[PDB]
Amino acid sequence: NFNVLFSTVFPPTSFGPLVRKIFVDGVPFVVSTGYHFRELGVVHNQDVNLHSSRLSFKELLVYAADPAMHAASGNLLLDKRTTCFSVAALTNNVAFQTVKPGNFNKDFYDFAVSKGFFKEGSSVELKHFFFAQDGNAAISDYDYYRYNLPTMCDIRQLLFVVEVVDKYFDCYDGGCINANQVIVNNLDKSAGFPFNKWGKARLYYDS
Amino acid sequence: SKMSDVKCTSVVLLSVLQQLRVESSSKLWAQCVQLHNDILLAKDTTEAFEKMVSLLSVLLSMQGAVDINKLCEEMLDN
Amino acid sequence: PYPDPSRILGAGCFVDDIVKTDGTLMIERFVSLAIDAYPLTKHPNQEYADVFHLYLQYIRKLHDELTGHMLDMYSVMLTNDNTSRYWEPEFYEAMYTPHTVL
Amino acid sequence: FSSLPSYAAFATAQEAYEQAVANGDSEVVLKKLKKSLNVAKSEFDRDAAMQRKLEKMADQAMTQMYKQARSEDKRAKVTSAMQTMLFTMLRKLDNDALNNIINNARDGCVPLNIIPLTTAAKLMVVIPDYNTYKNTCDGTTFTYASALWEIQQVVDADSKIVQLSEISMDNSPNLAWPLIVTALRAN
Amino acid sequence: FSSLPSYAAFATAQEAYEQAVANGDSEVVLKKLKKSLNVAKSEFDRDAAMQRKLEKMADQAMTQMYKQARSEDKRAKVTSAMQTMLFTMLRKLDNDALNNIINNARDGCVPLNIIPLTTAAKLMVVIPDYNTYKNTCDGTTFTYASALWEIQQVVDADSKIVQLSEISMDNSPNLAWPLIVTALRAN
RNA sequence: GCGGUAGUAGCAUGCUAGGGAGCAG
RNA sequence: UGACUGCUCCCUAGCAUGCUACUACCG
């Protein structure tokens, strides 16, 4: 609660991952070995090795998901469409994505009309459609995070509300489970950022 | 019944326009999307018709595109 | 519970291609849509029940179209065994009666 | 299922046993006849259901393949289907402005930009022959899309300005004909 | 299903018993026939069932091991792809400015948000309209992030080249406005 | 004379696995 | 380019259980 209030004074470029240079078989990398939160302060990693031999599969997975290399091997970007902080551009072009309209089922509409539907003055009419969007819609929708402001709370009252909420959440049980007890449905869905160039979640849950 | 007909016709017209690679011109695509979204939200059946005329003018002012005359001789539009 | 009739009709009339505009390829869409729209028959307003009845008639029409439309050019003969259950209200009435049959 | 050897054997056994029993006889003959009959009856009864399951399964498979072929066919004619459907609905709408502009485009008089709706803004059309000019443009006013417009400029294929008084029946056929009228919407 | 170990004994016993039956001998030979054939079929039963169970078990095992091998092959190829991507993106780190700002740190750690801000070679700017344009990147060289940049290219939302001579107040409404400006670090 | 056991066929019940679709937050 | 959950319907394959039936062995 106090960190939230005190973090509004310091510059906004000193928050986020902290990176440094490590060596793998004499070649230099750039990896993240900590974080600087606005709420939790400075956090340092516990198992970091600078000099190492050729890396394994899970190390590859960890280093391919870190934004450090992607941000450090990209161009600077100054975007004036939004007021949110911008880091880098990964390519030399900006992608504009549109949304297409729907498809019309004419047979069903004719069948419904031939049975006394959609007459004037009726109490049943169509008001659900597929709406189309232009090129600059994704960024315009992302720009709605400007409504999120830093908020300080009344701590002596939150510390009691949390007890009451915990009383509400009392009839269940939980804990940690092993990797062979995890249930996943529809393993044919997308996997994330770097990973959607090589397969779905099935590839990574099988490999 | 004269309003749902024009909304369905507008949906079909926007689909036809999208099939002709219109979204490769940002200004034209933005205007078409605005018109199509405005027709579906209409409440009276005069503004919808003028917007429909404006939207159909986009398809008519493309020379190669489609054949107006063949598509009018197939027991279709007069 | 009952939904908004406009939502059901809009789901009927506006789709993504191949998923509809040819009902015979997917008749199980309208069965689910009629399951969702069953409790509209107890509403005091009259069009609300007409939605459910229209869905049932469309399902029957689609089945008849499929059977005849397949018997004509090809010579495969179809049967109507335990298929008429989908255009009678007793299959849908059992989904809102307590006795969890699945 | 009367086209299998099992049916023939079962039928012959049934007839023989029935005739022997109706004639009247002892116990051992009945026991032997039923012992030789029941095996054939089971032989018939197994295939009587196996054939039905095979036939219905084959019918379902042919149904599924027809559906797949039809979907693959349907998803390959969408442009023509959509254009035909759109013009059918445009017929059914039956509006005067839409009919006017569709006939005008069908005869050759198409616009060059989006038709404006305000009391201002410019509209440009192409008039390829004298008959279209006679029908639409009379005087200094322009009738298009069930509206009224005021001519302010005429440009030819050579981009030279042509005054309104110049255009006439016999005075026209010495000109670059694809004219371009630019007008504004009358109040 | 026809050359099982017990098949020879079963068939030979059946043939001998039925030959004895066709010989028209007494009832004792018939009782012996019945007992021997009953026990022969009983012993053939499990020999015909266990083998069929075992074959299906073996087939399931083969299928599972094949799919395991395929999964291993896919894992190997995805590992190769990830390694290639990492080593390819390594080769653009500009290892002199990065080293110059790393050594200035008191322990080797620096925020990630200031690496592109002080070591990048190219800058990309997206401009909504002309009023914003004339306040950010007016002219041919501008200053941002305490550095000097010089323009190299300007494109529009359709990715077509645009020259700075036509980015004016009068000509503004004739461009796909989400313009993208590319510059290089000066000196 | 009754029961037990071993295969075979039809029918019903609940789970697991695969595929297609619908709704809700 | 396609997120996380929950519920429901349809089709096929396997497993377990139960009902009936047909032969055979044993007492």
Question: Does B69 lie at the interface with A, CB-CB under 8 angstroms?
Answer: no
Rounded distance between C-alpha atoms, residue D83 and residue D76, angstroms: 14
Contacts of A109 by beta carbon, 8 Å cutoff, 6+ apart: B8, C13
Strands E141-143 and E122-127: unpaired
Rounded distance between C-alpha atoms, residue E115 and residue A61, angstroms: 23
Q: From the CA of C102 to the C1' of G18: give the distance in Å.
A: 20
Q: From the CA of E43 to the C1' of F6: give the distance in Å.
A: 9
Rounded distance between C-alpha atoms, residue E157 and residue B23, angstroms: 11
Asked whether E41 and E6 are in contact (CB, 8 A), the reply is: no
Tally the domains of chain B: 1
Rounded distance between C-alpha atoms, residue D58 and residue A202, angstroms: 34
Sign of the CA dihedral A101, A102, A103, A107? Answer: negative
Based on the number of CB atoms within 10 Å of its own CB, is E88 exposed (0-12), middle (13-18) or buried (19 or more)?
exposed
DSSP conformational letter for B42: -
E147: left (phi over 0), alpha (psi -120 to 50) or beta: beta
Nucleotide nearest to C8 (CA to C1'): F23
Please tell me which chains touch B, using 3 or more CB pairs under 8 Å as the contact test: A, D, E
Rounded distance between C-alpha atoms, residue B58 and residue B23, angstroms: 13
- Residue A131's nearest CA partner among B10, B40, B18 is B40
Answer whether any strand G atom is within 7 A of the Cβ of C95: yes
Sign of the CA dihedral C57, C62, C65, C67? Answer: negative
Closest CA–CA distance from residue B11 to any residue of chain D (Å): 9
Which residue pairs from D62-70 have beta carbons closer than 8 angstroms and sit at least 24 positions apart in sequence? Answer: D62/C74, D62/C76, D63/C70, D63/C76, D63/C78, D66/C70, D66/C74, D67/C24, D67/C25, D70/C22, D70/C25
Nucleotide nearest to C20 (CA to C1'): F21
Rounded distance between C-alpha atoms, residue C26 and residue E157, angstroms: 41
- Cα E124 from chain centre: 32
Q: Which of C7, C13, C53 to mutate to test the interface with A (most CBs of A within 10 A)?
A: C13
Rounded distance between C-alpha atoms, residue C63 and residue C80, angstroms: 9
Give all strands of the β-sheet with D122-127 in edge-to-edge order: D122-127, D179-185, D148-155, D141-143
Query: E93: helix, coil or strand?
Result: coil
A109 chain-C contacts, CB cut-off 8 A = 13
Rounded distance between C-alpha atoms, residue E150 and residue E183, angstroms: 5
Between C10, C48, C57, which is nearest A129 by CB?
Answer: C10
Rounded distance between C-alpha atoms, residue D129 and residue D135, angstroms: 11
Rounded distance between C-alpha atoms, residue B6 and residue E9, angstroms: 85
Contacts of D19 by beta carbon, 8 Å cutoff, 6+ apart: none
Q: Which helix (H) or strand (E) holds E185?
A: strand E179-185
Between A98, A101, A129, which is nearest B15 by CB?
Answer: A101
Q: How many CB atoms lie within 10 A of CB A135?
A: 21
List phi, psi (to 5°) of E172. Answer: -60, -45
Closest CA–CA distance from residue B14 to any residue of chain E (Å): 21
What distance separates the 2 farthest-apart alpha carbons in chain C? 47
Contacts of D13 by beta carbon, 8 Å cutoff, 6+ apart: D33, D36, D37, D40, D41
Rounded distance between C-alpha atoms, residue E79 and residue A199, angstroms: 12
Distances (CA, A) of C78 to C65, D55, D59: 12, 11, 8
Asked whether E37 and E21 are in contact (CB, 8 A), the reply is: no
Q: How many CB atoms lie within 10 A of CB D170?
A: 7
Q: Which residue of C has its CA nearest to D59?
A: C76
Q: Do chains A and C touch (3 or more CB pairs under 8 A)?
A: yes
Asked whether A108 and C12 are in contact (CB, 8 A), the reply is: yes
Closest CA–CA distance from residue C91 to any residue of chain A (Å): 23
Question: Does B7 lie at the interface with A, CB-CB under 8 angstroms?
Answer: yes
Answer whether any strand F atom is within 7 A of the Cβ of C36: yes
Distances (CA, A) of A144 to A80, A138, A148, B12, E152: 15, 11, 8, 32, 33
Answer whether any strand F atom is within 7 A of the Cβ of E50: no
Beta bridge partners of A18: E111
- Residue D127's nearest CA partner among D113, D139, D144, D109 is D109
Q: Which residue of E has its CA nearest to B23?
A: E158
- Residue B4's nearest CA partner among D61, C6, D12 is C6
Q: Is residue A176 a known part of a binding site?
A: yes
Quick one: three-class SS letters along chain D?
CCCCHHHHHHHHHHHHHHHHHHHCCCHHHHHHHHHHHHHHHHHHHHHHHHHHHHHHHHHHHHHHHHHHHHHHHHCCCHHHHHHHHHHHHHHHHCCHHHHHHHHHHHHCCCECCCCCCCCCCEEEEEECCHHHHHHHCECCEEECCCCEEEEEEEECCCCCECCHHHCCCCCCCCCCCCEEEEEEECC
Distances (CA, A) of A149 to A13, A17, D175: 17, 21, 69
Rounded distance between C-alpha atoms, residue E34 and residue E28, angstroms: 10
Q: Do B61 and D102 make contact, defined as CB atoms within 8 angstroms?
A: no
Instruction: Annotate chain A with DSSP letters as a single string.
Output: -HHHHHTTSS-GGG-EEEEEEEEETTEEEEEEEEEEETTTEEEE-S---SEESS--HHHHHHHHH-HHHHHHTSEEEEE-S-SS---EESSSS-----B---EE-HHHHHHHHTTT-S-TT-S---------B-STTHHHHHGGGGG-------HHHHHHHHHHHHHHS-S-------GGG---S---S---SGGGGT--HHHHHH-
- Name the one residue in this structure whose structure tokens are 């390594």: E90
Based on the number of CB atoms within 10 Å of its own CB, is B31 exposed (0-12), middle (13-18) or buried (19 or more)?
middle
What distance separates the 2 farthest-apart alpha carbons in chain D? 126
Asked whether A135 and A98 are in contact (CB, 8 A), the reply is: yes
- Cα-only R_g, chain D: 42
Answer whether any strand G atom is within 7 A of the Cβ of E32: no
- Name the one residue in this structure whose structure tokens are 């009276």: B44
Rounded distance between C-alpha atoms, residue A123 and residue C50, angstroms: 12
What burial letters (b/e) apply to A184-200, b meaning 16+ CB within 10 Å?
Answer: eeeeeeebeebbeebbe
Nucleotide nearest to C100 (CA to C1'): G8
Q: Do C74 and D75 make contact, defined as CB atoms within 8 angstroms?
A: no
Rounded distance between C-alpha atoms, residue A31 and residue A22, angstroms: 7
End-to-end CA distance of chain B: 22
Instruction: Annotate E5-20 with DSSP letters as a single string.
Output: TTHHHHHHHHHHHHHH
CA angle (A123 as vertex; A121, A127 as ends), nearest 5? 100
Rounded distance between C-alpha atoms, residue A196 and residue A200, angstroms: 7
Query: E107: helix, coil or strand?
Result: coil
- Cα E140 from chain centre: 46
Asked whether D110 and D180 are in contact (CB, 8 A), the reply is: no
What burial letters (b/e) apply to D54-83, b meaning 16+ CB within 10 Å?
Answer: eeeeeeeeebeebbeeeeeeeeeeeeeebb
Beta bridge partners of E149: E142, E185
Q: Do E159 and A93 make contact, defined as CB atoms within 8 angstroms?
A: yes
B78 chain-D contacts, CB cut-off 8 A = 91, 99, 102-103
Domain with B20 in it: 1-78
Rounded distance between C-alpha atoms, residue D180 and residue D139, angstroms: 16
Q: Do D101 and B56 make contact, defined as CB atoms within 8 angstroms?
A: yes
Answer whether any strand F atom is within 7 A of the Cβ of D46: yes
Rounded distance between C-alpha atoms, residue C34 and residue C4, angstroms: 13
- Name the one residue in this structure whose structure tokens are 């069929």: E52
Please tell me which chains touch A, using 3 or more CB pairs under 8 Å as the contact test: B, C, E
- Name the one residue in this structure whose structure tokens are 């599969």: A57
Closest CA–CA distance from residue E107 to any residue of chain A (Å): 9
Beta bridge partners of E107: none
Based on the number of CB atoms within 10 Å of its own CB, is E160 exposed (0-12), middle (13-18) or buried (19 or more)?
exposed
Beta bridge partners of A32: A19
Query: E125: helix, coil or strand?
Result: strand
Query: E155: helix, coil or strand?
Result: strand
